[PDB]
Structure 1
């Protein structure tokens, strides 16, 4: 595929991450989403990082 794997890393400093894919060519803007961090047990901002 063209879509590359990325991690979404927790802003809470737990080291918890989600993984997803991204079309980096069309969307170079870094993905940022509020997601559930199960370590702190809260929704916090997650930010794109390299897989």
Structure 2
């Protein structure tokens, strides 16, 4: 179980986040994906952050 949990935080400022996992040793670069924010009801950019 080397993969670590991470959150993807909305760039829309709503506080909405998705969660997933990541192999941080092989892919140190931050994950960035366009995902649907149900608060603003639009697809926006989501960026990796710590899980908490």
Other-structure match for 2:45: 45
Q: Report the number of matched residues.
A: 51
1:33: how far off? Answer: 0.1
Other-structure match for 2:21: 21
Structure 1 residue runs of 5 or longer lacking an equivalent are none
1:48: how far off? Answer: 0.0
Listed one character per residue, the Cα deviations across residues 12-50 of structure 1 (whole Å, up to 9, x for unaligned) are 000000000000000000000000000000000000000
SS in 2 for 1:24: coil
**Rounded Cα–Cα distance in structure 1 between residues aligned with 2:3 and 2:20:** 10
User: What TM-score do the two structures reach when normalised by structure 2?
Assistant: 0.98
Other-structure match for 1:31: 31
